[PDB]
Design a protein around this ligand. Structure first.
Ligand SMILES: *[C@@]1(O[C@@H]2[C@@H](O)[C@@H](O)O[C@H](CO)[C@@H]2O)O[C@@H](COS(=O)(=O)O)[C@@H](O[C@@H]2O[C@H](CO)[C@H](O)[C@H](O[C@@H]3O[C@H]4CO[C@@H]([C@@H]3O)[C@@H]4O[C@@H]3O[C@H](CO)[C@H](O)[C@H](O[C@@H]4O[C@@H](COS(=O)(=O)O)[C@@H](O)[C@@H](O)[C@@H]4O)[C@H]3O)[C@H]2O)[C@@H](O)[C@@H]1O
Ligand SMILES: [Ca+2]
Ligand SMILES: [Cl-]
Ligand SMILES: [K+]
Ligand SMILES: [K+]
Length: 565
């Protein structure tokens, strides 16, 4: 396996090259007013964030009745924007059968437009649909999912029609907990996220989902397919993608309760890394992402919980029964942020021959950062190639974060005397190489994605499926097809694939695991091919499976084209 870095070629994801740290290196908190958390944020260069508080928790606190809103103290001064996501629990205190949805929406706009400081993102209800059958709701099931979507729609409509908020606050939804698009032969997609996009999507600035590994893995090809489907349908519906927001990502350890444990609760860090590389490659269509690691989470530390900390906590009190006076310990989740500290700059060109080895590279003035992650279940040796034999690179330091499920995190920083010829990387290990670079850019390469008017197509044995694409700027560089399929695990993953009539090789491998422990495979399989097969303008992809069943969920062409600028 090989990875190649060209630090003399600047890389763009459509219009952006620079890494936006604020899209990634965040905690699931807004506790920057805590002395310990605030110091951590500065020390590790971390942003915010997410909070369960908003117009509906504020209003209920005043009126003690769902769907009834107080008067907001009038305020007509400047509105500043704090970068975080405000969300609400999908409680009966916030939404209920019989609610006046237009009044609820009006209230969000009244609450925020009379505030001196608003969140950059409002995500009205957290994981709403999984709560649609909760006993306390007087409307349940599909009717409640529809009411929750109408609540979202009203909020987006009212916020956007308020000139004090429009352009300042972005409304995102639906904070999806369980992005099992494929369930029920894609009935789940049709009745959850498709329905959301159809019924509230016009009023949303972007679409939000939660991405978790069980410790059943979404990292790798499943999460890629999950997010590609949202983009692919948004293109069809709106004529363009809308940005994504990954309002939680991490791991869930499968534990009889949600209490923190020093070994089990750090297993999530490997998931942070595995998802991060996916999301870095989406920066041009990503508002924000939030690693699911929080703060002191003092709300959890109660008699009823035996004074345990919450699993997602970042700080653990030395004395849980004296919270007023206790010292607080920063746990080993800190090493996720240590690994990525100072990493920034313009993307530079990088490729990896093995889809299980995720690669990133950035150049910030005289510093070069090269990152690798192993999604496979075996160690892999990766040959590192550079066309200039690294002549301009010196003072190499290797950072390594290895998550072992029994031993916890092993984090090391080592000076090495030259860029390595090859690197061995074990499962759940992420490496960041930091070096000085003295070089200037002689070329750029621009990654664009092209979406089809066709999506969600049922597969029949021997029956070709045609996917048209338009507006392609072809040229020199690289290209690939992102082919997402949901099929029984035994169904073929090796269709015949033709690019403008020319058959191309379909790889055996894809990002991450085989999903053998799932009944339905739902994943994006990349099919690299020669860019020279693409034409300027219209292109067609035709694919044929030898067996029936399942669907092609989305087909997206990725083109990385050499460009001046
Ligand atoms: C979610 O869980 C995840 C799922 O979404 C999903 O993805 O699966 C995941 C598996 O990994 C997971 O289950 O996120 C969690 C986040 O954890 S955290 O980041 O560690 O916190 C949990 O969310 C937490 O849920 C708890 C309850 O279970 C709680 O709601 C947490 O938030 C806290 O709530 C209270 C207590 O501490 C503060 C936290 O935000 C907050 O304090 C309130 O703050 C407001 C101001 O913002 C007020 O001060 C309020 O005081 C009251 O109101 C004031 C007046 O205020 S106002 O004028 O109305 O504005 C006064 O009247 C005062 O007297 C009064 O007491 C104060 O309480 C939350 O983060 C999971 O539960 C969640 O599902
Ligand atoms: Ca693989
Ligand atoms: Cl659901
Ligand atoms: K605020
Ligand atoms: K969902």
């Amino acid at each position: 396996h090989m990875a190649s870095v060209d630090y003399n070629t600047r890389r763009f994801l459509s219009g952006v090259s620079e890494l936006d740290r604020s899209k990634y290196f965040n905690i699931h908190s807004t506790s920057d007013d805590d002395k310990d958390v605030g110091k951590f944020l500065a020390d590790y260069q971390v942003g915010l964030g997410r909070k369960f508080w908003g117009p509906y928790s504020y209003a209920y606190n005043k009126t003690h009745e769902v769907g009834k809103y107080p008067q907001m103290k009038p305020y007509s001064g400047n509105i500043s924007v704090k970068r975080y996501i405000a969300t609400e629990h999908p409680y009966v205190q916030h939404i209920q059968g019989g609610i006046d949805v237009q009044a609820a929406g009006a209230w969000s706009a009244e609450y925020y437009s009379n505030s001196e400081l608003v969140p950059e993102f409002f995500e009205p209800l957290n994981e709403p649909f999984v709560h649609a059958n909760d006993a306390g709701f007087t409307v349940q099931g599909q009717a409640m999912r529809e009411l929750m979507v109408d609540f979202y729609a009203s909020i987006g409509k009212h916020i956007h029609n308020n000139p004090r908020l429009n352009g300042k606050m972005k409304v995102i939804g639906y904070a999806a907990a369980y992005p099992a698009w494929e369930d029920g032969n894609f009935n789940y997609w049709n009745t959850r996220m498709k329905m959301f996009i159809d019924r509230a999507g016009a009023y949303m600035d972007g679409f939000s989902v939660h991405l978790y590994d069980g410790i059943t893995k979404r990292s790798g090809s499943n999460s890629e397919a999950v997010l590609d489907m949202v983009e692919a349908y948004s293109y069809i519906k709106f004529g363009h993608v809308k940005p994504l927001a990954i309002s939680e990502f991490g791991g869930i350890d499968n534990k009889p309760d949600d209490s923190y444990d020093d070994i089990s609760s750090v297993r999530s860090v490997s998931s942070f890394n595995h998802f991060l590389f996916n999301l870095m490659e989406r920066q041009d269509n990503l508002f924000i992402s939030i690693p699911f690691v929080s703060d002191k989470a003092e709300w959890h530390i109660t008699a009823a919980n035996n004074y345990t900390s919450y699993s997602a906590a970042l700080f653990i009190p030395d004395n849980p029964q004296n919270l007023k006076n206790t010292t607080w310990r920063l746990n080993d989740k800190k090493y996720f942020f240590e690994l990525w500290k100072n990493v920034k700059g313009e993307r530079v060109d990088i490729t990896s021959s093995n889809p299980d080895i995720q690669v990133q590279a950035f150049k910030d003035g005289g510093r070069l950062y090269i990152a690798l992650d192993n999604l496979d279940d075996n160690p892999q040796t990766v040959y590192l190639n550079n066309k200039n034999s690294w002549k301009d690179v010196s003072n190499v330091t290797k950072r390594s974060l290895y998550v072992n499920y029994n031993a916890g995190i092993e984090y090391t920083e080592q000076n090495v005397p030259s860029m390595p010829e090859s690197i061995s990387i074990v499962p759940n290990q992420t490496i960041v190489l930091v070096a000085d670079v003295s070089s200037a850019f002689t070329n750029s390469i621009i990654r664009n994605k092209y979406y089809s008017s066709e999506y969600l197509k049922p597969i029949s044995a021997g029956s070709s499926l045609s996917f048209p694409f338009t507006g392609i700027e072809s040229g020199s560089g690289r290209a690939s097809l992102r082919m997402s399929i949901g099929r029984p695990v035994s169904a073929s993953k090796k269709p015949v694939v033709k690019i403008n009539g020319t058959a191309v090789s379909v790889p055996d491998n894809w990002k991450g695991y085989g999903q053998s422990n799932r009944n339905i495979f739902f994943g994006m399989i990349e099919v690299p091919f020669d860019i020279q097969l693409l034409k300027n303008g219209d292109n067609n992809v035709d694919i044929t499976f030898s067996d029936g069943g399942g669907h092609v969920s989305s087909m997206i062409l990725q083109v990385e084209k050499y460009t001046v600028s």
